[PDB]
């Protein structure tokens with residue numbers, strides 16, 4: 054089997070991407086944030102505290118003939134930005150782009166933190182990291198991809214995120230028309246439960262390439278590119294007036310600037326992030342200070358190849374027995 058679904062930016066900044074997902078019978082379509090950095094599929098639901106729901110579409114398990122309470126199971130998760138959610142668990146039929154998993158754990162939110170309430174366009178998350186990170190207790194649950202894997206034509210999914218434009222998540226096949234050149238595959242460590250890999254270095258603009266190992270994760274659920282302070286400083290040093298602002302919480306730059314590109318290494322291959330992808334616009338409406346799309350990972354504890362990096366590439370998440378990540382230009 055295979056599946057193919059379009060993913061769409063939630064706003065003009067590409068802050069996140071949402072993908073329609075069918076849950077239950079008859080189908081209830083919710084727009085979920087596919088997150089290769091976590092492993093819970095959770096949804097706003099008829100159980101979510103009413104004061105914490107503001108415009109989201111909710112899953113109502115009592116209206117699904119295929120829903121079953123996963124008796125006694127609870128879940129509770131926090132994300133890198135400090136957001137969080139928790140609740141109980143149903144199993145139900147879940148379909149993404151024509152690919153169906155029966156008996157998928159659908160984690161129903163009883164509580165969500167303010168950032169989720171405020172994002173009226175995000176009806177929940179669909180985790181695509183390794184199932185070892187799933188938070189369901191006392192019986193840990195598998196991700197949608199893990200459940201689908203044995204039925205897929207190939208044990209892979211691909212992320213083809215757009216820049217201020219829709220893109221595609223495919224399951225079970227590699228669309229050879231979606232990229233240019235070759236896909237360079239690189240080894241993955243699952244030791245932390247992430248799609249963790251080692252980039253071979255970087256370049257700023259038209260500069261020479263610096264060969265240096267950068268361990269990090271491929272995370273579709275993170276907006277920005279978080280890299281070591283040394284790398285980030287070398288990038289922003291090329292932008293007149295750019296500075297790290299403690300009040301803003303990261304690097305800002307004059308909105309009058311044209312940003313240089315940023316290249317990252319994948320083995321002997323290179324992915325070039327255009328400068329425009331690094332511009333997240335005014336820090337507040339009307340401001341002439343713009344927020345940078347490359348930020349320091351210092352204090353996160355991990356480098357994160359988030360959407361800023363991933364949307365410059367066609368990315369293969371190969372979940373074979375020895376997992377790998379593939380990157381191609383596009």
Ligand SMILES: C#CCN(C)Cc1nc([C@]2(O)CN[C@@H](c3nc(-c4ccc(F)cc4)no3)C2)cs1
Pocket residue numbers: 069086088089090091131132133134136168169172175178272273274275352353354355
């Ligand atoms: C700090 C620290 C140490 N480590 C836990 C950092 C990491 N953190 C992650 C993720 O939690 C998993 N992916 C990303 C994600 N964030 C969201 C999200 C958050 C709030 C919203 F309102 C909407 C979406 N969705 O996915 C971050 C991986 S490593």
